[PDB]
Amino acid sequence: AWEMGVSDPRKIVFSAKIGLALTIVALLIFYQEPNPDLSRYSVWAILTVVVVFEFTIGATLSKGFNRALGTLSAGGLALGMAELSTLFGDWEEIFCTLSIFCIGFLATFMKLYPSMKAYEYGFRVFLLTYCYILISGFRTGQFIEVAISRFLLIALGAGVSLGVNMFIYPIWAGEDLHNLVVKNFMNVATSLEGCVNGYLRCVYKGYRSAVESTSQEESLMSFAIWEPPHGPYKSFNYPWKNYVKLSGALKHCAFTVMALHGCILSEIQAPEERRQVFRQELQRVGVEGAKLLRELGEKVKKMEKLGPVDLLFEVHLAAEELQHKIDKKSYLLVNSECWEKTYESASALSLATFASLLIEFVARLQNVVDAFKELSQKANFKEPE
Amino acid sequence: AWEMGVSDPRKIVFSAKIGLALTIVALLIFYQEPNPDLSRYSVWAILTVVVVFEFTIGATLSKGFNRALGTLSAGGLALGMAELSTLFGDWEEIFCTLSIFCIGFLATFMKLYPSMKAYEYGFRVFLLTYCYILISGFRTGQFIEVAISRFLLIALGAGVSLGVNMFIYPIWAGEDLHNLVVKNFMNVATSLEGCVNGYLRCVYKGYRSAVESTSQEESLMSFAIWEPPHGPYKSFNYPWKNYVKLSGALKHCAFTVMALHGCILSEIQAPEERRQVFRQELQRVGVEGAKLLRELGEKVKKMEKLGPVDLLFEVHLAAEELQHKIDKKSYLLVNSECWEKTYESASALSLATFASLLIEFVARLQNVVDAFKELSQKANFKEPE
Ligand SMILES: CCCCCCCCCCCCCCCCCC(=O)OC[C@H](COP(=O)(O)O)OC(=O)CCCCCCCCCCCCCCCCC
Ligand SMILES: CC(C)CCC[C@@H](C)[C@H]1CC[C@H]2[C@@H]3CC=C4C[C@@H](OC(=O)CCC(=O)O)CC[C@]4(C)[C@H]3CC[C@]12C
Ligand SMILES: CC(C)CCC[C@@H](C)[C@H]1CC[C@H]2[C@@H]3CC=C4C[C@@H](OC(=O)CCC(=O)O)CC[C@]4(C)[C@H]3CC[C@]12C
């Protein structure tokens, strides 16, 4: 309630816009001279403002196109089918009912298509429009006449909804993917630091969102291609795919962070004393990785280019130091007496796993800087301050 | 198309049932004596059969209840608000429009609630019903009269849709979670075998579905609690939660299989010659794990109890043999000259990671047999043949 409103004020603005549109339409309908058909068809303009408003502007311009195509096709097909059914006599009702049967069967079958999963609304609109335009009219000429009135009412409703949506505090879909990309870096860095600290002690939301939020960026990219230039994004063809590429490159490391976190919840764990021998190198590598990830995130937020100095010098050095430390004290991981209990060796061998996973992270942190450079070049960025 | 139909014939039956219901309703409406209001309100029975049909029976009995509650509450609130607005004079329209504003604002705000995410249809039905019942009627007594007719038509449509749905080849939601649980075991076993073979060579769908399909079982469990006894499930309170518990227990191992698969796609990999020294033990452990998983899956499919002999004897032995083999030849994983290049040791240390992950799998395969025993006891099973 109040906590939700204070946390995010965009929802309040959305609700206010919906209320304002509904109030405008209701006032326009009410303050009209009485008409015989002004009380029977005036409810068609208030049911169109509640079925056209969407959060983002791209989600409002991309779904309206489909919904239209569907409505127009269904209306045309229904009119043609009625005109063809008038051909025969004394048997029209049977043809109409068999047309309803075939149409419903085909609509349901095509709506159950794996690939066509997010377009259910279009098929349902098609089916409903066909049924209504045939049953309600029960005639060809009689119906076509009232189509004019019903289209004017539905277009008044859709025009008022579009006007109000695209003019009072618009919410663009291109400014959401950017914030998601920026937040992913911080989440991954926090998860890495938490995992390292938890292991060296006497971490889920970050990588969970980094991995799970893989289908929530494709939708935003699909919505953002319908919007016009607005502010910093000064172009008609903005490379919105490079953001998805960078997000996938970061998810690749997020998988390794997931594995590191899973290491903690294992049933076979090494003794604390052995863990407390590689503390400094592990903590240094963790801090350097987190710092580099946060630096990349901040650079993405401000839309700036990478400077001259390399960013992975300290991570690439801390990895070498950790490797050397593991090499020196590598007799605590594997016993040497039996060379040519099981639980003891199983618990002692987990530190090599942890070190190898950390090294894999540090060896997978370069694809995200290649992706960042590609993005910073495709979408013209500002030179570093 | 034809491939979809041959792969799954349930969709064809669903489409046929939808078509049959629509045809019955259309014939009933058409073959009726002409009435002044039989052509203006007869389209309200064909728009209710297309908005009430759902795949499963539980999904049809669980959503209808909410949709009803919402419709009834909205109608009552609208009637009360109209009766209260009649109190004043010459200013009713303003009160009605401010009621529309407040109702729309509250509806949108409560529909944007994180927790209330899957109940959007109920809120939209509430809002649409309120707006229609106020604007269309523009009166209290006049509207209440026609409510009888509109309710009879909507109940004829919903009754024909429910009859047709629950009598001609029903599709129960309790027979889908069972098949998902059975399929998960086979998928995980196949993924494990594929990963092992790929590593020992000169694997994604299984664990992906095991992990990803975590929210598709809660929905089935929620739908299955509305259905009555049918066939083998002879009880009014069936333990549908134990299936989810078993699925989560299997997902726990699926995470380790995910880590094993990720090991293959790493940038630092051990030499093939060193890999070819532990081939037999790894292959034996993989085969035993796959066989045990398939045995548990088959036992779940047939609804049978675990016999006397233990199931993890051979896995628990192959793990010991692998541990001994790693102990004997443990000088190929860590160098001994530097005791007190980096890439060489980094690549050589990955075999310990692979072995440790395999041992973790074999040490996490017991929670799934505890969960299976608990399920086999809570839901009375048949004694083994
Ligand atoms: C040449 C080209 C010609 C072009 C031809 C153009 C054709 C124009 C076609 C016009 C028709 C198109 C209509 C489409 C509009 C969308 C409609 C729609 O989809 O539905 C939304 C929606 C669609 O499904 P959704 O997207 O999942 O929400 O369905 C509904 O929600 C409507 C549900 C109907 C229930 C309304 C009940 C209100 C009255 C209840 C009274 C109960 C009183 C009880 C009292 C109790 C207390 C005593
Ligand atoms: C006539 C051609 C040359 C231009 C198009 C003019 C209108 C006839 C179009 C523009 C927007 C269309 C509307 C777009 C959105 C909707 C809401 C749509 O709602 C749903 O799809 C149900 C909700 C859901 O599925 O989530 C019902 C049809 C309708 C009113 C469409 C009817 C046809 C409209 C008014
Ligand atoms: C009156 C009390 C004592 C018993 C209930 C009798 C009827 C008035 C109930 C039973 C089923 C209800 C219907 C259940 C399902 C729907 C479809 C529903 O569709 C949607 O919610 C839109 C689609 C979607 O959101 O996915 C619109 C209202 C309606 C017809 C409901 C209106 C009220 C109905 C007819």
mmCIF file with all atom_site columns, C-alpha atoms in Angstrom, chain A residues 1 4-5 11-12 14-16 18-20 22-23 26-27 29-31 39-40 42-43 46-47 50-51 55 93-94 96-97 100-101 104-105 108-109 111-114 124 127-128 131-132 135-136 138 208 211 251-252 255 258 262 265-268 320 323-324 326-331 334-336 338-340 342 345-346 349-350 352-353 356 359-360 363-364, chain B residues 1 4-5 11-12 14-16 18-20 22-23 26-27 29-31 39-40 42-43 46-47 50-51 55 93-94 96-97 100-101 104-105 108-109 111-114 124 127-128 131-132 135-136 138 208 211 251-252 255 258 262 265-268 320 323-324 326-331 334-336 338-340 342 345-346 349-350 352-353 356-357 359-360 363-364:
data_model
loop_
_atom_site.group_PDB
_atom_site.id
_atom_site.type_symbol
_atom_site.label_atom_id
_atom_site.label_alt_id
_atom_site.label_comp_id
_atom_site.label_asym_id
_atom_site.label_entity_id
_atom_site.label_seq_id
_atom_site.pdbx_PDB_ins_code
_atom_site.Cartn_x
_atom_site.Cartn_y
_atom_site.Cartn_z
_atom_site.occupancy
_atom_site.B_iso_or_equiv
_atom_site.pdbx_formal_charge
_atom_site.auth_seq_id
_atom_site.auth_comp_id
_atom_site.auth_asym_id
_atom_site.auth_atom_id
_atom_site.pdbx_PDB_model_num
ATOM 1   C CA . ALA A 1 1   ? 0.000   0.000   0.000   1.00 0.00 ? 1   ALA A CA 1
ATOM 2   C CA . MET A 1 4   ? 4.488   0.212   -2.378  1.00 0.00 ? 4   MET A CA 1
ATOM 3   C CA . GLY A 1 5   ? 3.661   3.800   -3.301  1.00 0.00 ? 5   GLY A CA 1
ATOM 4   C CA . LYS A 1 11  ? 2.331   2.950   -10.326 1.00 0.00 ? 11  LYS A CA 1
ATOM 5   C CA . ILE A 1 12  ? 0.499   5.879   -8.724  1.00 0.00 ? 12  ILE A CA 1
ATOM 6   C CA . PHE A 1 14  ? -0.303  4.999   -14.018 1.00 0.00 ? 14  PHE A CA 1
ATOM 7   C CA . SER A 1 15  ? -3.416  4.638   -11.859 1.00 0.00 ? 15  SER A CA 1
ATOM 8   C CA . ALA A 1 16  ? -4.012  8.395   -12.002 1.00 0.00 ? 16  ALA A CA 1
ATOM 9   C CA . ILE A 1 18  ? -6.230  5.451   -16.035 1.00 0.00 ? 18  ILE A CA 1
ATOM 10  C CA . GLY A 1 19  ? -8.640  7.277   -13.744 1.00 0.00 ? 19  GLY A CA 1
ATOM 11  C CA . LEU A 1 20  ? -8.326  10.512  -15.710 1.00 0.00 ? 20  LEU A CA 1
ATOM 12  C CA . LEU A 1 22  ? -12.049 6.975   -17.582 1.00 0.00 ? 22  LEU A CA 1
ATOM 13  C CA . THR A 1 23  ? -13.366 10.214  -16.072 1.00 0.00 ? 23  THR A CA 1
ATOM 14  C CA . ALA A 1 26  ? -17.564 9.149   -18.725 1.00 0.00 ? 26  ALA A CA 1
ATOM 15  C CA . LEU A 1 27  ? -18.094 12.920  -18.697 1.00 0.00 ? 27  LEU A CA 1
ATOM 16  C CA . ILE A 1 29  ? -20.742 10.291  -22.629 1.00 0.00 ? 29  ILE A CA 1
ATOM 17  C CA . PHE A 1 30  ? -22.900 11.737  -19.840 1.00 0.00 ? 30  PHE A CA 1
ATOM 18  C CA . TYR A 1 31  ? -22.958 15.375  -21.001 1.00 0.00 ? 31  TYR A CA 1
ATOM 19  C CA . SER A 1 39  ? -27.860 4.791   -24.155 1.00 0.00 ? 39  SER A CA 1
ATOM 20  C CA . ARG A 1 40  ? -27.551 1.378   -25.853 1.00 0.00 ? 40  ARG A CA 1
ATOM 21  C CA . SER A 1 42  ? -22.512 4.333   -25.207 1.00 0.00 ? 42  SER A CA 1
ATOM 22  C CA . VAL A 1 43  ? -20.979 1.550   -23.075 1.00 0.00 ? 43  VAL A CA 1
ATOM 23  C CA . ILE A 1 46  ? -15.706 2.781   -21.669 1.00 0.00 ? 46  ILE A CA 1
ATOM 24  C CA . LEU A 1 47  ? -14.827 -0.894  -22.232 1.00 0.00 ? 47  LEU A CA 1
ATOM 25  C CA . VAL A 1 50  ? -9.684  -0.453  -19.907 1.00 0.00 ? 50  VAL A CA 1
ATOM 26  C CA . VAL A 1 51  ? -8.506  -2.949  -22.558 1.00 0.00 ? 51  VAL A CA 1
ATOM 27  C CA . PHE A 1 55  ? 2.397   0.095   -18.666 1.00 0.00 ? 55  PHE A CA 1
ATOM 28  C CA . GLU A 1 93  ? -28.643 -21.347 -40.242 1.00 0.00 ? 93  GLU A CA 1
ATOM 29  C CA . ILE A 1 94  ? -26.977 -24.728 -40.799 1.00 0.00 ? 94  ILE A CA 1
ATOM 30  C CA . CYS A 1 96  ? -23.664 -20.493 -40.216 1.00 0.00 ? 96  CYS A CA 1
ATOM 31  C CA . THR A 1 97  ? -23.478 -23.025 -37.382 1.00 0.00 ? 97  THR A CA 1
ATOM 32  C CA . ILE A 1 100 ? -18.950 -21.373 -36.215 1.00 0.00 ? 100 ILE A CA 1
ATOM 33  C CA . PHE A 1 101 ? -17.853 -24.955 -35.547 1.00 0.00 ? 101 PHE A CA 1
ATOM 34  C CA . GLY A 1 104 ? -13.805 -22.305 -33.288 1.00 0.00 ? 104 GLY A CA 1
ATOM 35  C CA . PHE A 1 105 ? -11.949 -25.551 -33.955 1.00 0.00 ? 105 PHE A CA 1
ATOM 36  C CA . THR A 1 108 ? -8.409  -23.201 -30.643 1.00 0.00 ? 108 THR A CA 1
ATOM 37  C CA . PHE A 1 109 ? -6.000  -25.452 -32.547 1.00 0.00 ? 109 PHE A CA 1
ATOM 38  C CA . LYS A 1 111 ? -3.961  -20.927 -30.256 1.00 0.00 ? 111 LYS A CA 1
ATOM 39  C CA . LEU A 1 112 ? -2.613  -24.135 -28.697 1.00 0.00 ? 112 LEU A CA 1
ATOM 40  C CA . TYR A 1 113 ? 0.498   -23.828 -30.897 1.00 0.00 ? 113 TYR A CA 1
ATOM 41  C CA . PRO A 1 114 ? 3.761   -23.897 -28.880 1.00 0.00 ? 114 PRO A CA 1
ATOM 42  C CA . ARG A 1 124 ? -9.417  -14.772 -28.764 1.00 0.00 ? 124 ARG A CA 1
ATOM 43  C CA . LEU A 1 127 ? -12.958 -15.616 -32.385 1.00 0.00 ? 127 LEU A CA 1
ATOM 44  C CA . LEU A 1 128 ? -15.079 -13.259 -30.277 1.00 0.00 ? 128 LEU A CA 1
ATOM 45  C CA . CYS A 1 131 ? -19.056 -14.849 -33.328 1.00 0.00 ? 131 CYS A CA 1
ATOM 46  C CA . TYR A 1 132 ? -20.435 -11.437 -32.342 1.00 0.00 ? 132 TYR A CA 1
ATOM 47  C CA . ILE A 1 135 ? -24.841 -13.911 -34.325 1.00 0.00 ? 135 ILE A CA 1
ATOM 48  C CA . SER A 1 136 ? -25.648 -10.346 -33.259 1.00 0.00 ? 136 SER A CA 1
ATOM 49  C CA . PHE A 1 138 ? -28.077 -12.102 -38.189 1.00 0.00 ? 138 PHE A CA 1
ATOM 50  C CA . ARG A 1 208 ? 19.104  -15.723 -9.299  1.00 0.00 ? 208 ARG A CA 1
ATOM 51  C CA . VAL A 1 211 ? 20.121  -16.009 -14.548 1.00 0.00 ? 211 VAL A CA 1
ATOM 52  C CA . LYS A 1 251 ? 24.990  -14.354 -17.039 1.00 0.00 ? 251 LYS A CA 1
ATOM 53  C CA . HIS A 1 252 ? 27.839  -16.616 -18.139 1.00 0.00 ? 252 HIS A CA 1
ATOM 54  C CA . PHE A 1 255 ? 26.524  -19.344 -13.607 1.00 0.00 ? 255 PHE A CA 1
ATOM 55  C CA . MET A 1 258 ? 25.895  -19.961 -8.755  1.00 0.00 ? 258 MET A CA 1
ATOM 56  C CA . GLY A 1 262 ? 26.214  -24.196 -4.285  1.00 0.00 ? 262 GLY A CA 1
ATOM 57  C CA . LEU A 1 265 ? 25.498  -25.958 0.742   1.00 0.00 ? 265 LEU A CA 1
ATOM 58  C CA . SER A 1 266 ? 27.319  -29.240 0.076   1.00 0.00 ? 266 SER A CA 1
ATOM 59  C CA . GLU A 1 267 ? 27.323  -32.265 2.375   1.00 0.00 ? 267 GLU A CA 1
ATOM 60  C CA . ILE A 1 268 ? 31.101  -32.840 2.201   1.00 0.00 ? 268 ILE A CA 1
ATOM 61  C CA . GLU A 1 320 ? 48.320  -15.615 -10.322 1.00 0.00 ? 320 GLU A CA 1
ATOM 62  C CA . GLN A 1 323 ? 47.655  -20.068 -8.084  1.00 0.00 ? 323 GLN A CA 1
ATOM 63  C CA . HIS A 1 324 ? 51.133  -19.708 -6.580  1.00 0.00 ? 324 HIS A CA 1
ATOM 64  C CA . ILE A 1 326 ? 47.840  -23.177 -3.970  1.00 0.00 ? 326 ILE A CA 1
ATOM 65  C CA . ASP A 1 327 ? 51.000  -24.557 -5.581  1.00 0.00 ? 327 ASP A CA 1
ATOM 66  C CA . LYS A 1 328 ? 53.147  -23.981 -2.490  1.00 0.00 ? 328 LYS A CA 1
ATOM 67  C CA . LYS A 1 329 ? 50.723  -25.542 0.025   1.00 0.00 ? 329 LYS A CA 1
ATOM 68  C CA . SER A 1 330 ? 49.251  -28.146 -2.348  1.00 0.00 ? 330 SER A CA 1
ATOM 69  C CA . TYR A 1 331 ? 49.951  -30.993 0.108   1.00 0.00 ? 331 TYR A CA 1
ATOM 70  C CA . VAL A 1 334 ? 45.634  -34.645 -1.561  1.00 0.00 ? 334 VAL A CA 1
ATOM 71  C CA . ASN A 1 335 ? 47.378  -37.172 0.668   1.00 0.00 ? 335 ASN A CA 1
ATOM 72  C CA . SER A 1 336 ? 50.770  -38.535 -0.373  1.00 0.00 ? 336 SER A CA 1
ATOM 73  C CA . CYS A 1 338 ? 48.819  -43.668 -0.626  1.00 0.00 ? 338 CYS A CA 1
ATOM 74  C CA . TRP A 1 339 ? 50.586  -42.981 -3.920  1.00 0.00 ? 339 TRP A CA 1
ATOM 75  C CA . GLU A 1 340 ? 51.691  -45.299 -6.713  1.00 0.00 ? 340 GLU A CA 1
ATOM 76  C CA . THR A 1 342 ? 37.108  -41.897 2.137   1.00 0.00 ? 342 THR A CA 1
ATOM 77  C CA . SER A 1 345 ? 39.796  -37.118 1.390   1.00 0.00 ? 345 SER A CA 1
ATOM 78  C CA . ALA A 1 346 ? 36.345  -36.179 0.086   1.00 0.00 ? 346 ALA A CA 1
ATOM 79  C CA . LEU A 1 349 ? 39.369  -32.140 -1.861  1.00 0.00 ? 349 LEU A CA 1
ATOM 80  C CA . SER A 1 350 ? 36.691  -29.402 -1.848  1.00 0.00 ? 350 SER A CA 1
ATOM 81  C CA . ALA A 1 352 ? 40.623  -27.375 -4.954  1.00 0.00 ? 352 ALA A CA 1
ATOM 82  C CA . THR A 1 353 ? 37.076  -27.186 -6.324  1.00 0.00 ? 353 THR A CA 1
ATOM 83  C CA . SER A 1 356 ? 39.207  -23.807 -9.562  1.00 0.00 ? 356 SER A CA 1
ATOM 84  C CA . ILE A 1 359 ? 39.871  -19.095 -11.268 1.00 0.00 ? 359 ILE A CA 1
ATOM 85  C CA . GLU A 1 360 ? 37.180  -19.924 -13.829 1.00 0.00 ? 360 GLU A CA 1
ATOM 86  C CA . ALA A 1 363 ? 39.019  -16.353 -16.624 1.00 0.00 ? 363 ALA A CA 1
ATOM 87  C CA . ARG A 1 364 ? 35.421  -15.676 -17.711 1.00 0.00 ? 364 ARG A CA 1
ATOM 88  C CA . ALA B 1 1   ? -0.155  -29.020 -37.672 1.00 0.00 ? 1   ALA B CA 1
ATOM 89  C CA . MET B 1 4   ? 1.335   -31.558 -33.527 1.00 0.00 ? 4   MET B CA 1
ATOM 90  C CA . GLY B 1 5   ? -1.868  -33.578 -33.794 1.00 0.00 ? 5   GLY B CA 1
ATOM 91  C CA . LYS B 1 11  ? -5.503  -30.794 -28.237 1.00 0.00 ? 11  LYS B CA 1
ATOM 92  C CA . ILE B 1 12  ? -7.704  -32.154 -31.031 1.00 0.00 ? 12  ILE B CA 1
ATOM 93  C CA . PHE B 1 14  ? -10.170 -30.001 -26.704 1.00 0.00 ? 14  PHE B CA 1
ATOM 94  C CA . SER B 1 15  ? -10.826 -28.174 -29.977 1.00 0.00 ? 15  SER B CA 1
ATOM 95  C CA . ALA B 1 16  ? -13.622 -30.611 -30.836 1.00 0.00 ? 16  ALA B CA 1
ATOM 96  C CA . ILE B 1 18  ? -15.059 -26.245 -27.884 1.00 0.00 ? 18  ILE B CA 1
ATOM 97  C CA . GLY B 1 19  ? -16.593 -26.536 -31.341 1.00 0.00 ? 19  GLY B CA 1
ATOM 98  C CA . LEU B 1 20  ? -19.372 -28.812 -30.102 1.00 0.00 ? 20  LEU B CA 1
ATOM 99  C CA . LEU B 1 22  ? -20.330 -23.452 -29.615 1.00 0.00 ? 22  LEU B CA 1
ATOM 100 C CA . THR B 1 23  ? -22.453 -25.353 -32.142 1.00 0.00 ? 23  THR B CA 1
ATOM 101 C CA . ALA B 1 26  ? -25.630 -21.418 -31.669 1.00 0.00 ? 26  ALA B CA 1
ATOM 102 C CA . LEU B 1 27  ? -28.311 -23.939 -32.645 1.00 0.00 ? 27  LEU B CA 1
ATOM 103 C CA . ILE B 1 29  ? -30.162 -19.559 -30.044 1.00 0.00 ? 29  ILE B CA 1
ATOM 104 C CA . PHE B 1 30  ? -31.066 -19.814 -33.738 1.00 0.00 ? 30  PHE B CA 1
ATOM 105 C CA . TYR B 1 31  ? -33.942 -22.310 -33.444 1.00 0.00 ? 31  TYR B CA 1
ATOM 106 C CA . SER B 1 39  ? -31.809 -10.648 -31.110 1.00 0.00 ? 39  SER B CA 1
ATOM 107 C CA . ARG B 1 40  ? -30.285 -7.948  -28.871 1.00 0.00 ? 40  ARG B CA 1
ATOM 108 C CA . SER B 1 42  ? -28.737 -13.466 -27.569 1.00 0.00 ? 42  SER B CA 1
ATOM 109 C CA . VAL B 1 43  ? -25.030 -12.723 -28.152 1.00 0.00 ? 43  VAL B CA 1
ATOM 110 C CA . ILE B 1 46  ? -21.892 -17.227 -27.071 1.00 0.00 ? 46  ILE B CA 1
ATOM 111 C CA . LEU B 1 47  ? -19.311 -14.898 -25.487 1.00 0.00 ? 47  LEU B CA 1
ATOM 112 C CA . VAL B 1 50  ? -15.319 -18.894 -25.111 1.00 0.00 ? 50  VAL B CA 1
ATOM 113 C CA . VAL B 1 51  ? -14.292 -17.256 -21.808 1.00 0.00 ? 51  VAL B CA 1
ATOM 114 C CA . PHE B 1 55  ? -7.648  -27.129 -20.513 1.00 0.00 ? 55  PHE B CA 1
ATOM 115 C CA . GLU B 1 93  ? -23.543 12.581  -12.815 1.00 0.00 ? 93  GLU B CA 1
ATOM 116 C CA . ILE B 1 94  ? -20.661 14.193  -10.915 1.00 0.00 ? 94  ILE B CA 1
ATOM 117 C CA . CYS B 1 96  ? -21.008 8.803   -10.620 1.00 0.00 ? 96  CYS B CA 1
ATOM 118 C CA . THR B 1 97  ? -17.950 10.072  -12.496 1.00 0.00 ? 97  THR B CA 1
ATOM 119 C CA . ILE B 1 100 ? -15.649 5.762   -11.643 1.00 0.00 ? 100 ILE B CA 1
ATOM 120 C CA . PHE B 1 101 ? -12.406 7.655   -11.029 1.00 0.00 ? 101 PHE B CA 1
ATOM 121 C CA . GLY B 1 104 ? -10.506 2.691   -11.529 1.00 0.00 ? 104 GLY B CA 1
ATOM 122 C CA . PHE B 1 105 ? -7.645  4.101   -9.468  1.00 0.00 ? 105 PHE B CA 1
ATOM 123 C CA . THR B 1 108 ? -5.366  -0.514  -11.060 1.00 0.00 ? 108 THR B CA 1
ATOM 124 C CA . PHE B 1 109 ? -3.380  0.028   -7.856  1.00 0.00 ? 109 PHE B CA 1
ATOM 125 C CA . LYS B 1 111 ? -3.877  -5.098  -9.691  1.00 0.00 ? 111 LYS B CA 1
ATOM 126 C CA . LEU B 1 112 ? -0.289  -3.811  -9.791  1.00 0.00 ? 112 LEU B CA 1
ATOM 127 C CA . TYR B 1 113 ? 0.380   -5.588  -6.474  1.00 0.00 ? 113 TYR B CA 1
ATOM 128 C CA . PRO B 1 114 ? 3.391   -7.961  -6.636  1.00 0.00 ? 114 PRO B CA 1
ATOM 129 C CA . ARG B 1 124 ? -10.384 -6.598  -14.719 1.00 0.00 ? 124 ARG B CA 1
ATOM 130 C CA . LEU B 1 127 ? -13.758 -3.063  -13.142 1.00 0.00 ? 127 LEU B CA 1
ATOM 131 C CA . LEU B 1 128 ? -15.536 -3.903  -16.403 1.00 0.00 ? 128 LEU B CA 1
ATOM 132 C CA . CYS B 1 131 ? -18.436 0.364   -15.385 1.00 0.00 ? 131 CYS B CA 1
ATOM 133 C CA . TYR B 1 132 ? -20.957 -1.531  -17.522 1.00 0.00 ? 132 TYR B CA 1
ATOM 134 C CA . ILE B 1 135 ? -23.056 3.475   -17.463 1.00 0.00 ? 135 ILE B CA 1
ATOM 135 C CA . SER B 1 136 ? -25.283 1.091   -19.425 1.00 0.00 ? 136 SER B CA 1
ATOM 136 C CA . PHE B 1 138 ? -28.025 4.859   -16.024 1.00 0.00 ? 138 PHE B CA 1
ATOM 137 C CA . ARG B 1 208 ? 17.025  -27.415 -17.649 1.00 0.00 ? 208 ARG B CA 1
ATOM 138 C CA . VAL B 1 211 ? 15.325  -26.862 -12.603 1.00 0.00 ? 211 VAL B CA 1
ATOM 139 C CA . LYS B 1 251 ? 16.089  -30.709 -8.446  1.00 0.00 ? 251 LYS B CA 1
ATOM 140 C CA . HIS B 1 252 ? 18.735  -30.585 -5.721  1.00 0.00 ? 252 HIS B CA 1
ATOM 141 C CA . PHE B 1 255 ? 21.804  -28.540 -9.736  1.00 0.00 ? 255 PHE B CA 1
ATOM 142 C CA . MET B 1 258 ? 24.120  -28.580 -14.089 1.00 0.00 ? 258 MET B CA 1
ATOM 143 C CA . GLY B 1 262 ? 29.110  -26.413 -16.991 1.00 0.00 ? 262 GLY B CA 1
ATOM 144 C CA . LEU B 1 265 ? 32.176  -25.566 -21.324 1.00 0.00 ? 265 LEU B CA 1
ATOM 145 C CA . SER B 1 266 ? 35.040  -24.106 -19.273 1.00 0.00 ? 266 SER B CA 1
ATOM 146 C CA . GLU B 1 267 ? 38.040  -22.250 -20.685 1.00 0.00 ? 267 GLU B CA 1
ATOM 147 C CA . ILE B 1 268 ? 40.640  -24.158 -18.625 1.00 0.00 ? 268 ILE B CA 1
ATOM 148 C CA . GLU B 1 320 ? 34.421  -45.661 -2.847  1.00 0.00 ? 320 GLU B CA 1
ATOM 149 C CA . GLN B 1 323 ? 37.879  -42.295 -4.260  1.00 0.00 ? 323 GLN B CA 1
ATOM 150 C CA . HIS B 1 324 ? 40.506  -45.032 -3.959  1.00 0.00 ? 324 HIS B CA 1
ATOM 151 C CA . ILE B 1 326 ? 41.908  -40.827 -7.128  1.00 0.00 ? 326 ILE B CA 1
ATOM 152 C CA . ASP B 1 327 ? 43.948  -41.470 -3.980  1.00 0.00 ? 327 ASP B CA 1
ATOM 153 C CA . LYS B 1 328 ? 46.381  -43.829 -5.718  1.00 0.00 ? 328 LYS B CA 1
ATOM 154 C CA . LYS B 1 329 ? 47.071  -41.594 -8.745  1.00 0.00 ? 329 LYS B CA 1
ATOM 155 C CA . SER B 1 330 ? 46.671  -38.261 -6.927  1.00 0.00 ? 330 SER B CA 1
ATOM 156 C CA . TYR B 1 331 ? 50.062  -37.006 -8.173  1.00 0.00 ? 331 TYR B CA 1
ATOM 157 C CA . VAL B 1 334 ? 48.908  -31.225 -8.123  1.00 0.00 ? 334 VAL B CA 1
ATOM 158 C CA . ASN B 1 335 ? 52.631  -30.825 -8.735  1.00 0.00 ? 335 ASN B CA 1
ATOM 159 C CA . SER B 1 336 ? 55.074  -31.733 -5.970  1.00 0.00 ? 336 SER B CA 1
ATOM 160 C CA . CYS B 1 338 ? 56.980  -26.582 -5.731  1.00 0.00 ? 338 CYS B CA 1
ATOM 161 C CA . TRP B 1 339 ? 56.063  -27.600 -2.186  1.00 0.00 ? 339 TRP B CA 1
ATOM 162 C CA . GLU B 1 340 ? 56.865  -26.024 1.171   1.00 0.00 ? 340 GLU B CA 1
ATOM 163 C CA . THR B 1 342 ? 49.990  -21.077 -14.022 1.00 0.00 ? 342 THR B CA 1
ATOM 164 C CA . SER B 1 345 ? 48.282  -26.237 -12.985 1.00 0.00 ? 345 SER B CA 1
ATOM 165 C CA . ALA B 1 346 ? 44.950  -24.536 -13.686 1.00 0.00 ? 346 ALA B CA 1
ATOM 166 C CA . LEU B 1 349 ? 43.342  -29.126 -11.320 1.00 0.00 ? 349 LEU B CA 1
ATOM 167 C CA . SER B 1 350 ? 39.982  -29.514 -13.117 1.00 0.00 ? 350 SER B CA 1
ATOM 168 C CA . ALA B 1 352 ? 39.642  -32.938 -8.948  1.00 0.00 ? 352 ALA B CA 1
ATOM 169 C CA . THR B 1 353 ? 36.690  -30.598 -9.500  1.00 0.00 ? 353 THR B CA 1
ATOM 170 C CA . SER B 1 356 ? 34.331  -33.888 -6.329  1.00 0.00 ? 356 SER B CA 1
ATOM 171 C CA . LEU B 1 357 ? 31.152  -32.912 -8.179  1.00 0.00 ? 357 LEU B CA 1
ATOM 172 C CA . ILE B 1 359 ? 30.965  -37.548 -5.421  1.00 0.00 ? 359 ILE B CA 1
ATOM 173 C CA . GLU B 1 360 ? 28.610  -34.756 -4.352  1.00 0.00 ? 360 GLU B CA 1
ATOM 174 C CA . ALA B 1 363 ? 26.163  -38.089 -1.736  1.00 0.00 ? 363 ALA B CA 1
ATOM 175 C CA . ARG B 1 364 ? 23.008  -36.138 -2.645  1.00 0.00 ? 364 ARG B CA 1
#
